[PDB]
Subunit: 331 residues, 4 copies
């Protein structure tokens, strides 16, 4: 006998499977911040980590495991092989190529496409009914790439999209008004990053439209330059990268918030990247951010935001650009 048998009498031996498993692919700064935030919010009964760098992967797994006493996630696993990811409810993709100096933006997109050609079939093999959450950049293109390779219905392929853009916007809006971001409502939609769209019409506090109160809101004529609040969202992203070399905490927190709605079937509305073909005159197979209802089936529904002619044209332009890149990709 052993001390374990001497101490514990076993009733059943039945080895069970997890009921609420989450996988994070890529254990970089983004991946690990998603992981800690998911662990601290008790969203999973099992967490799996996958990467190609075997040393960093094992080390990251061990560090999280060493914090088990302070967590409510009883099993943390990791591996190069996707068998560790079997029957995940949600799979978060944060894996990506490093831009290699003098490398064209198109070449970098194709290198991420080649990374996805290995990841996505492996994820689908072990978790065919999972929801895919894409973080890796350019997020709108890579959500399309994930959807194309997986063969999943559009509801199960979610792009992080304008979730962080909107979170940064609400932070800045909150600083200007001296109100908590939670009570400062405003939506940044369309293409994630530089080409995103601030929807001035929906910007409000307690249902009081800021555009109705201040008609110059979002225009160049605006004496208070509220257009700078969206400009600062883009500038802040470059500033964080210049100051600390990457972004981790804000993206990790935003992803755990999406994960919460999916895992708990909350049916909360989030600005995430979805297949927008058929909206705003877009005819191409492109993914853009709109407010989506997130639950156990991923994106079950989307909010049909009324956009101005200028806003509609900006999303249309982004669709044309993304399709222009996408049509040239080698699968």
């Amino acid at each position: 006998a052993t001390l374990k048998d001497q101490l514990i009498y076993n009733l059943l031996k039945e080895e069970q499977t997890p009921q609420n498993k989450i996988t994070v692919v890529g254990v970089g700064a983004v991946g690990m911040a998603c992981a800690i935030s998911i662990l601290m919010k008790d969203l999973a009964d099992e967490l799996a980590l996958v990467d190609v760098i075997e040393d960093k992967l094992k080390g990251e797994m061990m560090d999280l495991q060493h914090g088990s006493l302070f967590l409510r996630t009883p099993k943390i696993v990791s591996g190069k092989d996707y068998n560790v990811t079997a029957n995940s409810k949600l799979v978060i993709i944060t894996a990506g190529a490093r831009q290699q100096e003098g490398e064209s933006r198109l070449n970098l997109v194709q290198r991420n496409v080649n990374i996805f050609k290995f990841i996505i079939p492996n994820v689908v093999k072990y978790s065919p009914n999972c929801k895919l959450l894409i973080v890796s950049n350019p997020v709108d293109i890579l959500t399309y790439v994930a959807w194309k390779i997986s063969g999943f219905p559009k509801n199960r392929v979610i792009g992080s999209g304008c979730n962080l853009d909107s979170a940064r916007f609400r932070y800045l809006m909150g600083e200007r008004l001296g109100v908590h971001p939670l009570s400062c409502h405003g939506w940044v939609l369309g293409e994630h990053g530089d080409s995103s769209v601030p929807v001035w019409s929906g910007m409000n506090v307690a249902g009081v439209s800021l555009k109705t109160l201040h008609p110059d809101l979002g225009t160049d004529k605006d004496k208070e330059q509220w257009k700078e609040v969206h400009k600062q969202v883009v500038e802040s992203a470059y500033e964080v990268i210049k100051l600390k070399g990457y972004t981790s905490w804000a993206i990790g927190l935003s992803v755990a918030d999406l994960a919460e709605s999916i895992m708990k079937n909350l049916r909360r509305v989030h600005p995430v990247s979805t297949m927008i073909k058929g909206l705003y005159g877009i005819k191409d197979d492109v993914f853009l951010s709109v407010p989506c209802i997130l639950g156990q089936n991923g994106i079950s529904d989307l909010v049909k935001v009324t956009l101005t002619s200028e806003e509609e044209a900006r999303l249309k332009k982004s669709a044309d650009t993304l399709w222009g890149i996408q049509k040239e990709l080698q699968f």
Copy 2:
């Protein structure tokens, strides 16, 4: 009139002095993991970050601020100047430097000579929580420079060591670490002491059931559970270059007991002079009761002669280094 003035009527612009403020000094992997864990546990109404690297500091502050929508800590500030730390209830020190060993210690002492008087100036009634290594020596250094009473100078000590021990114990027994009780005391790190007599599940002593527990003659080699705590630390550093998540989580747990005055018992480094035949001004880990005044009380653990001797040896080593330090 501005849009803000048209939208909002102001009752009063009076701003209160910080109420549940926490400061983290050093924004390396350890400090930032402490920060995210404290933020996700809603322990503070204000978080301040300090470092000497101004770019990294501002970037770290901004990244946390950008996550405000998903948090319940309304004010996140940072700066090189300690005015940002004013009125903190708890100040966490994670700042750190073939070296001469006494040299490594003296480099961190020189860092503490700048940090500690600045912390004391802006938060004279704060509790100090030391993480920086060698943690037992630097808790002593912080206590000496600050002039604070012993209850307000807490060392992270064997909190991480015990958390790793309970994780490994839990894996061996197929039981959650929370239900696996065991204490690792004395000197943090390599020289720590596993108290085999207190290792239990549901109040059932593992040493009573298995007398060879903790000895070399144990066929099940339970001594390896403590050996793996030390080996795992070297393994994590070899694999990823540093430790962050586990230390971060353990520190936020200490912060919870202090901020909420819980009076829970934690293995932390305290002034041990007068215990286990120790006569020197050294800090070692024992189970301490943590609350709003820091360490108000300590548990008097009955140690075997071998355990007492190991703590005595650690005390002699630590004092040997300490007596040679320039302040």
Copy 3:
């Protein structure tokens, strides 16, 4: 030596003031539901309970204390004497007279006014710097009564007001749209209860105005009868009382949410009752619900909602009625 002295070495026995204390006055179904919700949200380091019924008070205190192992509030106290309430940051008043009319020659208002005449000076004595949160009905009159007796600045006297009304509205709105109440924005303002005002203009999902999409929203002409959502808020209150005899859980949860913003200085916007003199043509010392910014100083700011002529008239009517009762009250 005692077992305690053999086991524990004491460093100091310095009695320290509680840092985040909350008091609940009145341990009826409302007070106890506020108490459990505050305890389960870790908002306080000390909870005090006050009532006139000494048996029920002690029993309630003991029951909560017996749950200490599962909580993070280390000290729960109770008493008839207000010394137990000393140094509270927030004091919640849920005390009210027996509804059975025949017990007194005085009305419910008169009865609850005389109760406050004894409670409020005692609360002020032991916690002069506290924030007062009034739940007791008629909540708008008794918030005025608390403000008048206490002598506190308007920012430190908060009425529960239309917080429950708006929470029920968002629940019903959510059921109609198949969206979580969190993502369904809508404000019920003015006088708490039967005479409350649904602000149709601010009703939205993702910043998309429901009134802009559906101009008949809130009118009698509306084929979908959205006006019934507000009617059901009032009907549901009577239905809960008819079915179980009182309301507890929903009010308790709503109060703990207000307590969270105050205790954590969140500066979130809530529909609560505040001194409305200087707004909507109101010149009297009356308290009505408007969206208020809640933090460590209580109500530091209020949102100036643009109301329709009909909406403005309804608040004005409530103000005239409230003042009519109030002017006749003897202090």
Copy 4:
């Protein structure tokens, strides 16, 4: 087109089975306290309530639903019919009414409840709170036909929680850091295991050998005595107990729902242990997870402690053998 259709575009109408459903049977003070505690801890994606009193049941359901904005449980349902309980992972029984008479009345209540629960949730874990809890866990196990791992009794979980509260008050330490186990028969006949009583792994019995004896100058035996006295005191003062039991049950629910494998003092089938040969349920430290009780801790009991559990087993079996199923 309707406002809903103008506002929202639907991708799919596929409505899955609930993944983390909990049912509470009986909406008295105990059941409702279990409900609020479970809702505030985010343990379920769906909560179902069942009772025989239709008005109180609907009212309780509505009150909880009105708090949805502040919760993370998107669906709260209720009904007299057990179809509302379909596909529950955990079913909590708090329903209830001479001793053998009172037991039989509760057995007759269980004869209706248990087959209905089993019909709609055959793979659920049963958590019994209703008194006498040890007898009614046996009744539930017998009627359901479930394996012993899926029939859990609240047992000495509350007794232990009260013990740790009182131990914490004596020592000036948080109950979490005060370890001590109350086992055997729930209530009046419970057993305090003095050998396991400790703070930071320091045995109180080793420091103070008189601990738990009549000879004890400090009368530590009174801490256990006060656990039983406090239960009568709460009932005398407010008429029932709700908050402490609700919080203790939500803690058990957390370990089961999240498969934590934490050790709890709960009622399990103890035939084969401590010389007990009868089909009786008593509290011992059990490992709780997604399959209910997968394992139990083999606590070393003294001859006196063993005899107390044996006496409880004889009494419980004496009542059980006389029950009409």
